[PDB]
């Protein structure tokens, strides 16, 4: 007991010493020689209306046109973002949904929430209506995030401090990821879908191997609950938004925090975070009803996306980087370009 | 106009979806949403019976459809999902009166702390609370031998069922920091009482009328 605690403390000290030794310079002191991105002015182009409750999640399709959103009114709406047409409206058995995922193939959609069940709906049914194809159960906490890897496997994070990679056809947890001491609030899948980062309420993010199934890395530095996480497009870094007013960029290979994006005028929490196509711009949704676009290399607040009357709950960027969708508690999705 | 036949039919489908969504929202707006809360075995199961994650109980009383959401067994950080219940019509908080002589930290003190946290959080500033002081039949027997001074040493009243119940109710109501803007509907229930649903109906009727006054710009 005491000996094991002392050994754990020694290992943590060794890890911190290695991190400090590898921290020869900082990204801020390196990116002083590059020009700033200037004032980013993303104007709103589409406003998606039809959700009648607070919108909690939203995921873009890989075609960068179809967009799924989940609202507390028990609705999962699939939008044609180009024409603002409602392609699909799925009634949910549980109206307390906090996450939704869109399959890369587009044939399936996912949702989940306080029911502790990840519901997967088939969009390409022969009967022509969207029917529930799977109900993955086994998590003992609320479903906070879910992300498809393919049409048969999905990684879902829960409030029971664990994540799970499932087999949709069998309905069983292929792999269980445990080690977070707090509720896992977000997930992000690497571009190769071989690793994924999960941030939890223990103010910690964990890099997990999907196939191997163990925690590859652990990242700390946030002072409160981590609510959002997103891989950098390169796949060697990821950004975390926390309940404090700080976003933090961590590098996988350096195993360290690179930069902190924060301002004294910002004091509210962070709900969503995402990168642009190049990763130069970091878009974060805040409780102050606004979104902030930061220069990911210089930590300068490049711009502000304002126009939501309530808390910005979900944020997403298209695979082609064409537009940014922001869903807020005011029951509207806004597309910015 | 500048739309193909398939585009026009897709727009028609979107309009039909909009109409269905409006109908569903109108139907759901007339439903009374209750959030069932408690410190544990405080009678929530009995209340649900007489009236793995979220549990939903649907029941129609006097032309009002009630959806009661029980969050027991979640066993996670409440602050991470309590904001989902911001718009509920009311919060039904169940407290076991006989728990004053039990401990987990005293059970009654834990119930009071949970009630304070639920009432005074940023998400339930104006939400009304129906306080169900359950197990009054067992509390009457317990108060005959077990004094209330075990839970509240400051209690100077006589060890009687009525006085002790009134003191407990006053102590629970004193946890409200926004008494002007929020009302607490304390009720006493023992077992299989048919008047509990009527009390809930009256409380939610008052809440609904107040909400209608607020929405119409009249309050």
């Amino acid at each position: 007991l005491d000996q094991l605690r002392q050994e754990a403390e020694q290992l943590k000290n060794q890890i911190r010493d290695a991190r400090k030794a590898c921290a020869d310079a900082t990204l801020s002191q390196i990116t002083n020689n590059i020009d700033p991105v200037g004032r980013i002015q993303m104007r709103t182009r589409r406003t998606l209306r039809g959700h009648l409750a607070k919108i909690y999640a939203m995921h873009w399709g890989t075609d960068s046109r179809l967009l799924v959103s989940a609202s507390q009114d028990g609705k999962l709406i699939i939008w044609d973002s180009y024409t603002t047409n409602k392609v699909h409206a799925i009634p949910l058995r549980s109206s307390w949904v906090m996450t939704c995922a869109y399959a890369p193939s587009g044939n399936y959609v996912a949702c989940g929430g306080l029911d502790n069940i990840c519901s997967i709906y088939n969009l390409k049914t022969r009967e022509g209506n969207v029917r529930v194809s799977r109900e993955l159960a086994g998590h003992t906490g609320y479903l906070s995030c879910c992300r498809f890897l393919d049409d048969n496997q999905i990684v879902t994070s829960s409030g029971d401090t664990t994540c799970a990679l499932w087999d949709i056809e069998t309905g069983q947890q292929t792999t269980t990821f445990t080690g977070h001491t707090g509720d896992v609030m977000s997930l992000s899948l690497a571009p190769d879908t071989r690793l994924f980062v999960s941030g939890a309420c223990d103010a910690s993010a964990k890099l997990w191997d999907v196939r191997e199934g163990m925690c590859r890395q652990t990242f700390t530095g946030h002072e409160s609950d981590i609510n959002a996480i997103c891989f950098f497009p390169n796949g060697n870094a990821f950004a975390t938004g926390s309940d404090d007013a700080t976003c933090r960029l961590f590098d996988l290979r350096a195993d360290q925090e690179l930069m902190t994006y924060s301002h004294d005028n910002i004091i509210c929490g962070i709900t969503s975070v995402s990168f642009s196509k190049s990763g130069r711009l970091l878009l974060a949704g805040y409780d102050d009803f606004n979104c902030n676009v930061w220069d990911a290399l210089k930590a300068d607040r490049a711009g502000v996306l304002a126009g939501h009357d309530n808390r910005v709950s979900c944020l997403g960027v298209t695979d082609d980087g064409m537009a940014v969708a922001t869903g807020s508690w005011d029951s509207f999705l806004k597309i910015w370009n | 106009c500048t739309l193909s036949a398939e585009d026009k039919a897709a727009v028609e489908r979107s309009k039909m979806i909009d109409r269905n969504l409006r109908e569903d929202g109108e139907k759901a707006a007339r439903e009374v949403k209750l959030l069932l809360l408690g410190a544990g075995e405080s009678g929530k199961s009995t209340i649900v019976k007489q009236m793995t994650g979220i549990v939903e109980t649907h029941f129609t009383f006097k032309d009002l459809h009630f959806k009661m959401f029980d969050v027991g067994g979640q066993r996670s950080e409440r602050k991470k999902w309590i904001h989902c219940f911001e718009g509920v019509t009311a919060i039904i908080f169940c407290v076991a009166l006989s728990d004053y002589d039990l401990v987990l930290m005293n059970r009654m003190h834990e119930s009071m702390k949970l009630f304070d946290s639920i009432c005074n959080n940023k998400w339930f500033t104006d939400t009304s609370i129906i306080l169900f002081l359950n197990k009054k039949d067992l509390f009457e027997e317990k108060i005959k031998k077990s004094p209330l001074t075990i839970c509240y040493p400051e209690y100077a009243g006589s060890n009687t069922y009525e006085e002790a119940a009134a003191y407990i109710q006053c102590q629970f109501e004193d946890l409200n920091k926004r008494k002007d803007t929020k009302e607490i509907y304390t009720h006493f229930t023992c077992a299989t009482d048919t008047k509990n649903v009527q009390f809930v109906f009256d409380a939610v009727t008052d809440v609904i009328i107040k909400n209608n006054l607020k929405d119409c710009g009249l309050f």
Partner: single-chain antibody, 233 residues
Framework: DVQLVESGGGLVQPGGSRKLSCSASGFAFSSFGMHWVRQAPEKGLEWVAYISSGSGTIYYADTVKGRFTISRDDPKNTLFLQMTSLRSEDTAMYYC??????????????WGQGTTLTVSGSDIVMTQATSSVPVTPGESVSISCRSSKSLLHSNGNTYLYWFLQRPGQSPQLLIYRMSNLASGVPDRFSGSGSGTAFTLTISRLEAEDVGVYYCMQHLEYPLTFGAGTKLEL
């Protein structure tokens, strides 16, 4: 699974009225638009009428406008076509066609068996260069078609549909929007086009896809079909 059964055909004296019905099963009939399509005994397919989901929009061909009435009863999942003052030119096999419309959808994907009814100008015209093509299994066959107006729209969609009708069978959707392979269709069939001239290429052809190939336009609403390219041997 999906099933459309037609009824009400037979002998009708000229100037009479008949009520064709189409019972639907295996799919959410209320959420689909429904078409009535004619095929004369040897003159190929011809669009007749259409009713939208929820009966929002109702359309008829100029040949049957003012005489035919299309309707739908969603609770009983039935499609109705009342024909009054039937002429000698109305003798044909009638099909009820399921057709849904959203982004990425596959309309005209299911056709009913159809019933035979025997009676005692500015729209886009679709033409097919060849009427009968003698083919041998294992080869590649290219069926070509042309349109009076370019089927490419401002949204980038080219509304062309390739259907196959086998002998004794209802037409089956092969290609929708000139490039998309319909569900259940093998990768042998591929669609291509330049906006006004289109080709359908079949590789490693077998005896299972021998029939008449029809091209249909969906850009301008009055849906018109090609003459039909029959494959033999």
């Amino acid at each position: 699974d999906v099933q459309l059964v037609e009824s009400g055909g037979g002998l009708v004296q000229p100037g009479g009225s008949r009520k064709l019905s189409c019972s639907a099963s295996g799919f959410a009939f209320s959420s689909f638009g429904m078409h009535w399509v004619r095929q004369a005994p040897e003159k190929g397919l011809e669009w007749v009428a259409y009713i939208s989901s929820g009966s929002g929009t109702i359309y008829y061909a100029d040949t049957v406008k003012g005489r035919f009435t299309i309707s739908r009863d969603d609770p009983k999942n039935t499609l109705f076509l009342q024909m009054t003052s039937l002429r000698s030119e109305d003798t044909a096999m009638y099909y009820c066609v399921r057709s849904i419309y959203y982004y990425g959808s596959s309309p005209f994907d299911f056709w009913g068996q159809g019933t035979t009814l025997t009676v005692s100008g500015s729209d886009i015209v679709m033409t097919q260069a060849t009427s009968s093509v003698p083919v041998t299994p294992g080869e590649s066959v290219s069926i070509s078609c042309r349109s009076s107006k370019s089927l490419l729209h401002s949204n980038g969609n080219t509304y062309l549909y390739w259907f196959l009708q086998r002998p004794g069978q209802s037409p089956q959707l092969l290609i929708y929007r000139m490039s998309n392979l319909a569900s259940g269709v093998p990768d042998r069939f591929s669609g291509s086009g330049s906006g006004t001239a289109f080709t359908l290429t079949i590789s490693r052809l077998e005896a299972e896809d021998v029939g008449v190939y029809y091209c249909m336009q969906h850009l301008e609403y009055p849906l018109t079909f090609g003459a039909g390219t029959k494959l033999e041997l």
